[PDB]
Amino acid sequence: LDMTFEVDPMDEPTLLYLLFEVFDVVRVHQPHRGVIEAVYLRTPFSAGN
Amino acid sequence: AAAAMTATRMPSSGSSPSVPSSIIAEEKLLALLAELEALSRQLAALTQQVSELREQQQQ
């Protein structure tokens, strides 16, 4: 993906804030007394491999 | 290219009523056509009796 933006020149340093909207979901399993196993999947833009 | 570019950049319509006053009306009209005949009748009656001087002086 390539993207280009045209903006009013600001006369000072500024930042483009770009949010790529994705699912950012967790599933939490509690199988025994005092155990928390949480599984995370963000997709697309997944963090891992 | 930049700085100012952030914002943006007939004949005849023929009215009629102009700057005069208001207007009103009423419906009690027109005796006046009778006097035009009154005036020209009585005018004849003048001359008719001028003649009645002359037609008695001529006797």
Beta-carbon pairs below 8 A across chains A and B: 4
PDB resolution in Å: 3.3
Q: Name the structure determination technique.
A: cryo-EM
- A21 is written with which tokens? 């909207």
Exposure on the CB side of residue B53, measured as CA atoms within 13 A:
5
Q: Are A4 and A22 in contact (CB under 8 A)?
A: no
| Alpha carbon distance B53, B59 (integer Å) | 10
- Chain B contact present for A9, CB below 8 A: yes
Chain B CB contacts of A8 below 8 Å: 5-6
Map residue B40 onto helix, strand or coil: helix
| Alpha carbon distance A41, A26 (integer Å) | 6
- A17 is written with which tokens? 């804030």
- B34 is written with which tokens? 């009778």
Closest alpha carbon within chain A to B4 = A8
Q: Residues of B7-46 as b/e, b for ≥16 C-beta within 10 angstroms?
A: eeeeeeeeeeeeeeeeeeeeeeeeeeeeeeeeeeeeeeee
Q: Are A21 and A44 in contact (CB under 8 A)?
A: no
| Alpha carbon distance A31, A33 (integer Å) | 7
- The candidate with the shortest Cα–Cα distance to A44, out of A24, A22, A26, A25, is A22
Closest alpha carbon within chain A to B5 = A8
